[PDB]
Symmetry: D2
Subunit: 327 residues, 4 copies
């Protein structure tokens, strides 16, 4: 039995006796992701470059892959009839869905993350988090400001050498590979569990001069291990989604901590940090700011930022211990 | 005018008054690259996971992405009738083409570079160097031992967010985007020049403990600039084809020096270093071991290794200066 | 609001408060159809012709597009956990599903119809019919032998200039276009209604010498109309699915009546005639053997054949009237 | 050896010692065909139905499949720099290429044949004839008025269940299947010969009332063979590129004679009849008006019509004989 993402979401909804709304939603996401992968890989680009002249587009009509992705997600999630509030990294205010189209879910998402790696063709992705609306209040931003522990679903798609969608829900993490020949995501790894202890460390060392003493001490120990074993390898793609996926698949540790330009960290809590922290915990890994769990921070601003350390349990705890030692 | 790789190649052929044999060769190579790009993106993988039944291939005896890539390249290039000797990373010996398919070209390639990245779905690519056979004797492995200065053409395909072929010949370097909807490479950057100076440095800092003092000093300048300017950012994908392509397009530096641990460096002279050094020089960059131009080494083994430092000419010149000052 | 086939089947199941099983089934069909379209269009055929040598397949391994289609349908329908009996034109006996995989539906299908048009690249398709199992008896052939009026769902996919899936259920017929870029069927025509009266007649006139007097009289009147208007155009692709689709879209009449080689007709009742007759009636058109409604014949053999006339109401009734006049 | 159209074309170029200009032209034409094949198969149609929003194109002002095809062909062929005069069905006048893009070839094409089939999704195709400019004067429409005997190359792409390019030149006819997974045409039938005699006849019998007595007599022989052999089967897709390709591959006959109604026939001499007659003769078939070889007519208008009867040489010879016996 081959298992497609479609069959799997549907069968899980049936196990949960859902009314179908969340199913509809996940199907939406899965379509929007295909639509993104295909534009990311440059299909149809010969039209941009005048294979057929220029008469297709009018006055001015084009999209940057970032704007296009954003429109795809918004419109496809709205068509699911499943959502009430969306938060996009691209919109300064939460988007409230029109009542005729309104369902009970809240979706925070990064439509295309890794934008410093776009023009150089390095791996980029899409990051998403889903909440049930709590309240019966007229929908509003407040419904987005839930801590990560309350996610129903979260994950990301990675547009790498191939396209992969990873999905975490209450019972674990499953990976599905996009077969672009038929437009199906094919379950390829079931119940994914992160190695306890990796041998790769992943951070931008360009900020070495602005790290705190604990990051600095940890990095040193990665290079010059007190016990004299082989040093961790370094890997920093520069796209959170790729660096985080490698982390999950290979083991190891990923860091984006505080720096002067970003004293509170760079990465966004809602659509970058929380989803990736939920995937990580369901896969038996950890996700800390250095001081507390990411999934426990109650956010107060939809574009709030937080420091993030995540990955294999022994590597992250090893880092927390340095923090606990310096404090 | 839209310009496809096939048209460009063919015009370049007529300007130079070639017999057609080398053009034949470049069309072949472009065909191999589209075929690998498709396998890499995972089309028809649904067949591998039992969608049409016959589900005993689960303990995989079937060929890996790298064995496929190799077979395509070797096969598509014999069928060009333009080559006599091939060297592939995956073959311990030079391949001597059958007399009835013999042509006058020698080809060095790394059918799929970035194998540690294969699993985690991070960018990977293909790299090639083309030479002419000078010798009038039987073709043999010595035919592939010609310094990089002698290259007639070299380049690489990156399988990243999208697939790009970058091709450098005597008159400079061009970038062609693969539009997978019609299987054409489209010209998108003509006559590419890297910038004098970057703000990115790329090296596996995991080996800090094995770094020679010049590397160590340079790295320190990048993080703690003595003149208090902005620190360079750090990126290491860990696929040479990706780090290199970023270096080309954004500027900056890429390093794989000898550590104490492995004294000649890790990267291979004939089908990793040479083609990349040639692309970089043709683009205005430099490519040095620290002590000499990469392209001037006389290779003595077709799997020989070399340290390589390549990229923006100011950033490489500055490192060169540290090496000297370390007398 | 763009509507994909996925969203639509799911939303219809939710309107009907289904438990999801039929939904699962239709999703299965929709995946299997994509898998078929892609093989039909020859993706990957370069491997057949040794783009990479021959080392992929072992001993002997290949499929004819007919056998491949059949395996796709069987395995994909079985994985839906929704079916109990399948009937394929390819299998002499009804297939009973294993109990661990057993749902309540019966599916009769032609995995790839139009086989005389395969080697010449003319349009071919897939035809399907679905029944609820009536009985509580241990599943058996008997569950397939239901008249057409008891179909829950039926339709076909056409592999033509583009790929289209047409689906009829209790409330009408909807057409969905396969966008091969993203693997989504996109609803493109809602509530399709056949023109009352066409201007095209479609039959193999090669059997003119073996038609009955009514077919002969009707054909004549198509060419030499008593009222002196413009004669009907002729069109006979030789694939039931294409000829039937044109009929639906353009109006007109399609005929495969009795001939000496086939006194009871050629086309199969279960997987060729019944599904196409259900689509036709839901679209406001007719479907008769000449003597009775197709959907009313209670079949007694899963491979039973029946004569078929179908299409626009005034054209078919006009033909029935000739039959009623000769009897 | 696998043989792609690009490689074949290029070898044919070197055997004949061409300057490269015509090869350039054929590569262009193959590129146009892949681009049309993609539009025809409906990739990115999800964009047209509002998947990324911006859903005011619903009253379609945007260009039809046939206007797109035309633009591609005209544009890809000017960019070859190999042509001076083009004639397209869709242009009432010959196009004279700009001096700076001028080459020596004249091209007659029907960018998308089978327009009555466009909607119903039945096969459609593209047809082309290439000539040399003899004249030394300014290029003009008269340059395209050279009889089919003068063709340097002609052929057609069928967009059917799959897409095929069939190319005929002085030494015969070859069939290339498009593998859309890598955008290569692969050689699959080399040096194609039609069979002496078929068992299929293809004509729009809707015009029976306007048929000349020879056609009428021949049709009668096909249904009621005087010698009591098996009656021919009948097929009429109604796309010339499809009926013709079936005729080529299975044998038999294809007819579009003059009816009383339209005395010169319907099909166009320069870009429908000529290229097909040339493919048929090069394959061992015949192509006659009933009174003369198609390829020998001196055209006098670039949109002139001709009756055409083509296919197996015994089946056409037999009709020719009826025409004579009708003195
Ligand atoms: N496809 C699904 N996968 C996993 N859990 C689901 C699914 N559908 C429903 N559920 C669970 O059931 C709850 C109610 O579902 P719904 O009725 O669709 O809003 C959800 O919030 C989930 O916890
Ligand atoms: N397509 C081409 N692009 C660039 N240079 C070419 C091309 N074809 C030939 N040349 C130059 O002409 C030389 C001889 O061509 P050939 O006879 O095809 O080997 C080559 O070694 C190149 O230096
Ligand atoms: N997706 C659907 N579309 C149309 N009708 C449906 C759907 N799902 C269920 N139904 C109707 O509800 C019945 C019971 O559905 P099920 O519980 O899935 O077997 C079916 O036999 C259909 O008549
Ligand atoms: N690729 C080719 N295939 C077949 N014949 C060709 C080719 N190239 C050139 N020829 C023959 O050589 C003539 C002159 O070639 P060109 O100089 O490219 O126009 C053409 O008119 C053809 O007859
Ligand atoms: O260049 P920096 O500061 O290391 O940040 C790169 C990071 O920023 C982001 O692009 C912000 O989304 C992440 O994808 C990535 O990890
Ligand atoms: O893990 P390391 O030692 O940094 O190796 C990474 C390098 O190895 C290679 O995979 C070998 O080709 C290169 O692509 C890449 O630069
Ligand atoms: O060649 P004939 O006898 O006209 O029959 C062709 C018919 O047979 C079938 O191939 C049988 O499925 C149909 O697809 C098609 O209508
Ligand atoms: O409906 P008719 O008159 O038979 O015309 C069909 C013919 O017309 C055309 O569409 C005109 O190109 C041909 O493709 C086809 O043979
Ligand atoms: Mg973003
Ligand atoms: Mg982001
Ligand atoms: Mg390799
Ligand atoms: Mg390598
Ligand atoms: Mg069949
Ligand atoms: Mg059939
Ligand atoms: Mg036309
Ligand atoms: Mg036409």
């Amino acid at each position: 039995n081959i298992v497609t993402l479609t069959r799997f979401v549907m069968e899980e909804g049936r196990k949960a006796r859902g009314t179908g709304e969340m199913t509809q939603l996940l199907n939406s996401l899965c379509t929007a992701v295909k639509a993104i992968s295909t534009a990311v890989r440059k299909a149809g680009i010969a039209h941009l470059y005048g294979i057929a002249g220029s008469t297709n587009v009018t006055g001015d009509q084009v999209k940057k892959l970032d704007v296009l992705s954003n429109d795809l997600v918004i419109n496809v999630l709205k068509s699911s009839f499943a959502t009430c509030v969306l938060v996009s990294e691209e919109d300064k205010n939460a988007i409230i869905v029109e009542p005729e189209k309104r369902g009970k879910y809240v979706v925070c998402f990064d439509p295309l993350d890794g934008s410093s790696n776009i023009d150089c063709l390095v791996s980029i992705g899409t990051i998403f988090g889903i909440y049930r609306k709590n309240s019966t209040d007229e929908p509003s931003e407040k419904d987005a400001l839930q801590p990560g522990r309350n996610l129903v679903a979260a994950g990301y798609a990675l547009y790498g050498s191939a396209t992969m969608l990873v999905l975490a829900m209450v019972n674990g993490v499953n990976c599905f590979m996009l077969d672009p020949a038929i437009g199906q995501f094919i379950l390829v790894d079931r119940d994914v569990k992160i190695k306890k202890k990796g041998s790769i460390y992943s951070i931008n060392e360009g900020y070495a001069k602005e790290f705190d003493p604990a990051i600095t001490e940890y990095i040193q120990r990665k290079k010059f291990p007190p016990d004299n074993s082989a040093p961790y390898g370094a890997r920093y793609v520069g796209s959170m989604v790729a660096d985080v996926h490698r982390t999950l698949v290979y083991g190891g540790i990923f860091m984006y901590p505080a720096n002067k330009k970003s004293p509170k960290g760079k990465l966004r809590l809602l659509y970058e940090c929380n989803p990736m922290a939920y995937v990580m915990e369901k896969a038996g890994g950890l996700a800390t700011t250095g001081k507390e769990a990411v999934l426990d921070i109650v956010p107060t601003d939809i574009h709030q930022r937080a420091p993030i350390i995540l990955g294999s349990p022994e590597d992250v705890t090893e880092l927390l211990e340095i923090y606990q030692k310096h404090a």
